[PDB]
Amino acid sequence: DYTLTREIVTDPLNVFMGKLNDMVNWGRKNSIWPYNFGLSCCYVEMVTSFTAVHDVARFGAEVLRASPRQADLMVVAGTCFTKMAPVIQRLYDQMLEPKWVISMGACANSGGMYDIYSVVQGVDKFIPVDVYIPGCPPRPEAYMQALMLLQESIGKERRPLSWVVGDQGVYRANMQSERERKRGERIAVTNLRTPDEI
């Protein structure tokens, strides 16, 4: 099951262009450069993930280009203020295809605790979001888990190989949600450690 952007369609995938699509998706997902965009405390945990104690460099996501042209992924990590929302939209428009968006934190997800006059209630109001991370702030390993989720999201999506041959629309897989996938093991939890110890 896939979704078009130029519509809910099926999988269109001879065998040579199939292997080409898997190789292109593998190269895209194994080399994702985030854009260095500092908004709020969620970016502090993002750069905490960037340091040596968590090693986001292992996933090939450590180049951290200061220009949106050289970046493939926008990590909106912070509150979406009304003054900063045109800046976010302009920086998103400056990025080039393929582009993916990770919302980091409850502010970027939905506005979070700041349902206030000067905060846009979520970055999905004006730019599309690929991965959402709950948390305030999400811990750095949660950001790396969201990076892995984006990696398997990219790994089966279909994009044109060239701009002159083939269908130019972009396919995005309707993935099974992590909630229903993890419900089998989350409900079975019965006992946890008592909060009186270290």
């Binding site: 929302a85 045109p86 939209q89 349902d115 206030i116 006059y117 846009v120 004006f126």
Partner: peptide, 18 residues
Amino acid sequence: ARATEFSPFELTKAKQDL
């Protein structure tokens, strides 16, 4: 105090002044 409804028109014109 609470947030007003979002409009892409306000965002687009604010992009024009930006």
